[PDB]
Design a protein around this ligand. Structure first.
Ligand SMILES: N[C@@H](Cc1ccccc1)C(=O)O
Ligand SMILES: [Co+2]
Ligand SMILES: [Co+2]
Length: 277
């Protein structure tokens, strides 16, 4: 009744560092099928995302020379990424402990799951994979304000861990880095990686009247649950990456303590103070 999960299967014969969870990218393990899956996913998103993704995202794909036709060589991408904002990507086996993830970000390393979904999982994979982590997350690292936000978020891990507040930080990450929307004069656009790599959440999040699109509010967000197994019911909207960086700059310690005994909002709740857009 129990079978090895995709993370376990993909990593057989491989190792990882016991402290930081990294390994050299195993290039020999990508089959022709992997490159074809990558090319299909990349083509699909590049057709769907113009006028949906924020323009910075599309520019990042191009400036970083993210390969269209094969899984990218992480070292090669790093040459461009390092020159831009002093970040690099590191390969990891899949999901890693929160404190290790934060320590990477604090040091301007972005952890990327090395392996790719199988063609049968083309439409959707639950686990992060190299398409979601690299295509979805990495292009916005060219934006210096976004990159500074990620670094600051990483640095925030130490205080959060010490206060038992990692789930509150996780909610902020989920509702920004993973599933954030950004308002523009041309209309709302997408910056969250979990939407940018998705087959159809990119359509729903902008085109459907169903989800609630709520103005960013730090306390609301850190008090809001999310689910990992369907489309989001609430998206939070920033006005700029600068607004995001500034709103998250103050001391979170009093915010964590006030939220500690609070009843969190459900993934589909509208709070009394929400700016609903
Ligand atoms: N300002 C937060 C750190 C942080 C920065 C950016 C994003 C998330 C958290 C703190 O006091 O710990
Ligand atoms: Co292990
Ligand atoms: Co992600």
């Amino acid at each position: 009744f129990v079978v090895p999960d995709i993370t376990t299967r993909k990593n057989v014969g491989l190792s990882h560092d016991a402290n930081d969870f990294t390994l050299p990218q195993p290039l020999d393990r990508y089959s022709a099928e992997d490159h074809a899956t990558w090319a299909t996913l990349y083509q699909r998103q590049c057709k769907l995302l113009p006028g949906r993704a924020c323009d910075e995202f599309l520019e990042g794909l191009e400036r970083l020379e993210v390969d269209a036709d094969r899984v990218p060589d992480f070292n090669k991408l790093n040459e461009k990424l390092m020159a831009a904002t002093g970040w690099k990507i590191v390969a990891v086996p899949g999901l890693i402990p929160d404190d290790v993830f934060f320590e990477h970000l604090a040091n301007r390393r972005f952890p990327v799951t090395w392996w790719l979904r199988e063609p049968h999982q083309l439409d959707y994979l639950q686990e992060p994979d190299v398409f979601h982590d690299l295509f979805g997350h990495v292009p916005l690292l060219i934006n210096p304000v976004f990159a500074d936000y990620l670094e600051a978020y990483g640095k925030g891990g130490v205080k959060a861990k010490a206060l038992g507040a990692l789930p509150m930080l996780a909610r902020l990450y989920w509702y920004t880095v993973e599933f954030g929307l950004i308002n523009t004069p041309a209309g709302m656009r997408i910056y969250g990686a979990g939407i940018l790599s998705s087959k159809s959440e990119s359509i729903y999040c902008l085109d459907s009247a169903s989800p609630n699109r709520v103005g960013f509010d730090l306390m609301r967000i850190m008090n809001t649950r999310y689910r990992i197994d369907t489309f989001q019911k609430t998206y939070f909207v920033i006005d700029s990456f600068k607004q995001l960086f500034d709103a998250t700059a103050p001391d979170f310690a009093p915010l964590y303590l006030q939220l500690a005994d609070a009843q969190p909002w459900g993934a589909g709740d509208i709070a009394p103070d929400d700016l609903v857009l």
